[PDB]
Ligand binder design. Structure first.
Ligand SMILES: Cc1cc(=O)oc2cc(O)ccc12
Ligand SMILES: Cc1cc(=O)oc2cc(O)ccc12
Ligand SMILES: Cc1cc(=O)oc2cc(O)ccc12
Lengths: 564, 563, 563
């Protein structure tokens, strides 16, 4: 004999904790050749106020896992799990005790407050107890940024000098990926080693895990460094693709379209500038790729927008900590991940993508320029931004602010409006299309009205929603929130909103609250705001495990959709 | 810085050889940020009778490779290549001299005749000089089969005994993957390290590279051991998927459907038999999987067909001990062995065809026949001699008919009276031609459910059928090879596929002379005129070790490779 | 059972080609549980003037390989091999025909002249026909240098600027590693994938394969990037160590001591300068490490020597912009660049010798000279022109003397009056011959701390010295090459080593014609008679791409390879 496999737990197979080895708060009930249907799983709340997690499991899932997927376990706990099915026409039920192990943070040093990120529940309105949020955050590595792309030497550089760096390889950090419930408990953990290894020098396993977005299959896409991925809630890495050889440094976003493709935000490696110098470009290219990893289309933004436009670039906050100081651009800023104009500098900093199925177009959030729609035809359709700095042909594409009745609102070139609640967005994020059809944006608000304010705390962020009339070329602000909440609700970077049709709320995550508060944990604030009354239905704070460490994004995840 | 990159070769960028590192007879012309269109590549023939290779290159390819793909080089040679394009409305052309290195066989030993498999051009009709063929063949490793799946110990077994083996892990061999032109020159090579490593004991890089099929994108799918793949002619691995956790041992076939899914042939690991014993089943499940590697559907053939049917199994060549008829036993231990029941090689399914018309699959069972099975998991029809089949299945058997539609009388063994009609035996590649007919490679071992008096009395056929599903009849409408006898007999493997572009039947017999101890095995590439039956192409491929079968070959077209 | 292993070839086991998968011109005769002794292998020459290769094989090797190691095959050939042994007191012999595959260069592009480096046999004196030489050379990758270490941003730098680079990660190139016989045939090849992968971005498989040195076991040590290695002539990787975490960028040398430790040349990562800025230092630390990869000792040369000394640095060829004298600057950014101070290439140490007699190390500093440093971390003596050196170091300078022991008068630039005596400049391989003398390859760039009127006025020397450490004197006792002029001038790399078996000076000039734009670079293998100065061997190796330096070569002996 050798060693036997786990024996059957009840009326099906063994119950396997973490089948794929990437998700320790998950398990699987082995099917053991049983033919079953009507499968329904219930993970009971831990103790008194504990949140219960419940979902149906589809056939494709049962077939793919060869078993019933168990999602929503607590760490280091004797979880109580109920699985119900139909077998041979008869109704069946098993009760399992599924013991779990611990969540490990593999990236800790003297900066660490503790191992895990802390949660504080601030508000949970009745009827929102069941909400689950996936938090896409990260934690500093001991080493810090240790690698650069090698670039091309400029003719004006010292003859003796080594070659310069290029691109944005140092944009690299350990991931911290979990689902939190409304009691503030971790109910899912993605092992950090799934995608990342910050101790090895294998660039295939470095980067910044970002752009976690749900697919039509209830699975998720993601980007990290030079690869893009698809994974599921069982921790199965379903796709792992290298970027096509011409491109590098995928960050911020990955979204599956209805046509089966995936949009990514990358840079072009070995991009030849008009002066013949080769650079890796920064955050200014869009790819459409298929599940074969092949390029279906590319948008080179350096030829579509205006890379010499510094209207917003010059209005920016230097901040860490050289904070509260307006960015002074320089002609000789060396190429690299650096504020500046031109291909090879961070002139666009595109940070989100939305696919408009209606006209086969894409909407981009550019942190440093504004928000634009670009066609399949590579033509600018419209731009949402202050008018300053834009030249013709592009100035003609700026949308015109109007009111509820459609009458022009009067705005200066800096985007400051007269006698109106209307305001443009500035250093914004997640310009997405809601189920309503409108354009929702997280208006971070750094460099608002194209200047820094008199004092540093005079900043605020907004959840805003616009209605756009494309034929008329008009934009109407139709909803906003957070303007009154001041610095204490200001995320200078990252962050996301998304409209939730099911309970008519606006979901939001402010990812860098108190970023600049030296020695203080950064706050990620999960919010759900009632769309009609503007009341807080959910407010949950996530505190970084090291001081002054931004979070990136969060998602409202629904267990009902996870296992098609 | 420090060391500079390759400089531009002509008017575009550098020309890199084997950019992905898996295809040493390819190159890439870096785009270097040039905006180009109307691209056309030409690789010139080597010497006097050398075959030129020419193709257009699409925008998707330009964008994917960040350059112009150069396919069809010769090894260890100063290839002459011409690239034409349009840029700023101007017509542009470059001529490049692209030097290549050598093709390496990493699996040689005292059995090796030489390093590479030898090609002999026998016949090339005018107008067929341009043809290219991808040969999916293999080469023995020094150690042979070295790993087994662990099975469950049987209760009739000894108390002290170690557990048995199960499944088919030993089905494992180094790949030998190349494209040959009609001068018998190698024009493409897939490095053996791309997918395989027979020296390491990482099961993820083991198995039997098989089922190389073109996709709608001009790329190819393949299976090997516990993974399935997609790659392209630049040697880029586009997909690499583990089989879903319930399944094992993917062999023989992989085909992309029009719905974006892929059909695979696997076995079930930890399959619970009715007597409670768990086994890895052998070559009797079909998976439909999506490009995420998830299971869209599963056909469990042990519940759809009849695993107890020994009609054809009992009548098989044992081949060390070839020639002999296979005497089955009730106690054959579970494993990759001839036998009945789940956990033995009762079915040995070796090809799949998706029928888009009714959303069903056509399967070739080496040991049972050819069957259509529906999305609903119901048998729609069976092409096979009637012996051994019982109701409810017996009634799905197709009935042979003539050109006018009248019954052909056949005994239960598939022997027909006064007819060219014959069923298929131990067959392969039951596919659906562009005509809508069923093409099969009829290997012919166990023909008429018996062994012949003499081994040399065996023959193989290309054969084609017209099926009326409504009427439930089958009509043999084309055959070839019966009259070529033994020197055309492939006991195993092999394939045919109807070519509409030039009305030929393409064929590859993979195991000609397999049983001639000490002799190279012959893989014969053939294009046969569909009307005249004239041999338009015949090329023989000889194994680099004796008694080493080839699997399949494909007719590849350069103008489809780079979408 | 499934697929059988290779069967026995003769009276032992199967004969496997490239058993470890890294050395395609080797084979192994499986022992198959035979108990043998007195083993001798003979690989016969190819054709008329072919060099036979013969050697004994020890019990340790038999046991390690589980078989008889076959070394010295030709590529793509039916090698004839004879194996003799003793078994049960009977004398035994087998003759094997061992077929091989081809040698592959995986790094080719439009710069490629052809796939392999070309060899030209110029001179082979009788009694030197058997000589074998391992050539440690390299080949440009398509992309060139693509990665940098990230450094610490300097406070005099722009607020908006991204952080700078540091260290020498770009020092990275595909290896080209082979053994040539005196017919100029390749008799061994180390697969480039053994250690390197220039297509992937796994830094563990990057760098510059260097410092290949024989060990007391007849195996070899090497360094590449962030790892050090030990391998043998069967292509077996015996050790693979990461550098200790404080260190980076191992280049140029690796030598095993008699105490079981290994000496390496690295840089320090996160080295804190006195101004508080952290850098990866360049080529200025020596590690002694044990076979566990642990640090036994460290020599930090930035505290032992003088990093501010620009005597030789200021006088260097800039070579794109070759010929020009190097005009140093105070603001040269830290990095792999000519300059003073920690974090610039002030030292560029390129060889190490352990002196067992007093437990000290002799170093060659390309930019400073030759120095002995003790276990105690004290400078024992310095071989260099006196310019730029200040006390306390100035006083450790050796003083030149004649055969009778009398002073030779030299200016501060190393120009001597009425003497053959000259110091070394930008030199390499300051080793200790079996005679106890110091041998150096005097490249000669920056000779006499100046550039010449004309570039063609440069020459290189083999040179030998007798040092009295007690007296503090140095005596030039042998030189060669000054009178061969430019066609013998190696600006960089290169090596010599005294051969006692036949009283020759072995040499390899690695960069002959380096600056002839568009021309292959020449690596010249030489054995020079120590008494007569007659050229006993001269073989030229030509780079596969223009202007591509070679590093080193070693004289290898088959009868030592298999302990
Ligand atoms: C300044 C900064 C820090 C960070 O950790 O992440 C970022 C992500 C962005 O998209 C833009 C800016 C930052
Ligand atoms: C009998 C046999 C030997 C082999 O080497 O390969 C095979 C492949 C198959 O699909 C079926 C049978 C065989
Ligand atoms: C100048 C130079 C070029 C090179 O390719 O390799 C080198 C190696 C060295 O140790 C020192 C200098 C060089």
């Amino acid at each position: 004999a050798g060693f036997k496999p786990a024996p059957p737990a009840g009326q099906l197979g063994a119950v396997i904790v973490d089948p794929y080895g990437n998700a320790p708060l998950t398990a699987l009930v082995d099917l053991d050749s049983h033919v079953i249907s009507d499968v329904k799983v219930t993970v009971h709340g831990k103790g008194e106020k504990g949140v219960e997690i419940s979902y149906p499991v589809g056939q494709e899932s049962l077939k793919t896992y060869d078993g019933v997927p168990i999602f929503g376990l607590y760490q280091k706990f004797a979880n109580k799990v109920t699985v119900e099915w139909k077998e041979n026409g008869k109704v069946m039920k098993d009760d399992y005790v599924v013991h779990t192990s611990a969540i490990v943070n593999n990236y800790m040093d003297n900066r660490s407050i503790s191992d895990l990120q802390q949660t504080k529940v601030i508000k949970v309105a009745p009827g929102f107890e069941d909400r689950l949020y996936l938090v896409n955050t990260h934690t500093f590595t001991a080493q810090g940024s240790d690698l650069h792309w090698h670039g091309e030497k400029d003719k004006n550089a010292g003859i003796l000098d080594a070659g310069p760096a290029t691109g944005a390889l140092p944009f690299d950090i350990a991931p911290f990926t979990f689902i939190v419930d409304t009691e503030g408990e971790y109910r899912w953990w993605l092992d950090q080693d799934t995608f990342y290894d910050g101790r090895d020098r294998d660039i295939n396993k470095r980067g910044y895990l970002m752009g976690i977005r749900e697919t039509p299959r209830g699975t998720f896409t993601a980007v990290q460094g030079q690869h893009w991925y698809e994974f599921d809630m069982m921790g199965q890495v379903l796709e792992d693709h290298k970027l096509p050889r011409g491109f590098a440094d995928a960050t911020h976003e990955s979204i599956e379209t209805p046509n089966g493709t995936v949009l990514l935000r990358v840079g072009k490696s070995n991009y030849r500038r008009d002066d013949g110098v080769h650079v890796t470009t920064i955050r200014d290219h869009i790819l459409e790729v298929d599940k074969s990893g092949r390029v279906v289309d590319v948008w080179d933004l350096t030829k579509i927008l205006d890379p010499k436009r510094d209207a917003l670039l010059g209005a920016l906050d230097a901040g860490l900590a050289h904070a509260g100081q307006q960015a002074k651009l320089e002609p000789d800023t060396p190429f690299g991940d650096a504020l500046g104009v031109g291909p090879g500098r961070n002139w666009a900093h595109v940070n989100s993508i939305a696919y408009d199925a209606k006209d086969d177009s894409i909407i981009l959030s550019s942190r440093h320029q504004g928000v634009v729609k670009i066609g399949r035809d590579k033509q600018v359709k419209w731009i949402l931004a202050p008018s300053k700095g834009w030249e013709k042909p592009l100035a003609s594409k700026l949308l015109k602010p109007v009111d509820a009745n459609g009458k022009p609102i009067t705005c200066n070139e800096n985007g400051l409006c007269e006698n109106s609640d209307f305001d443009f967005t500035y250093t914004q994020h997640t310009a997405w299309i809601s189920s309503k059809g409108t354009l929702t944006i997280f208006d971070n608000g750094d460099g608002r009205h194209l200047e820094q304010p008199a004092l540093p705390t005079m900043k605020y962020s907004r959840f805003v929603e616009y209605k756009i009339d494309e034929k008329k070329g008009t934009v109407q602000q139709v909803w906003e929130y957070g303007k009154e909440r001041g610095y204490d609700f200001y995320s200078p970077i990252t962050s996301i909103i998304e409209y939730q049709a099911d309970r008519n709320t606006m979901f939001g995550f402010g990812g860098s609250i108190h970023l600049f508060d030296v020695g203080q944990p950064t706050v990620g604030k999960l919010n759900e705001i009632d769309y009609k009354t503007k009341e807080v239905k959910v407010e949950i704070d996530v505190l970084s495990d090291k001081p002054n460490q931004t979070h990136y994004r969060a998602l409202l995840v629904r267990p009902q959709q996870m296992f098609k």
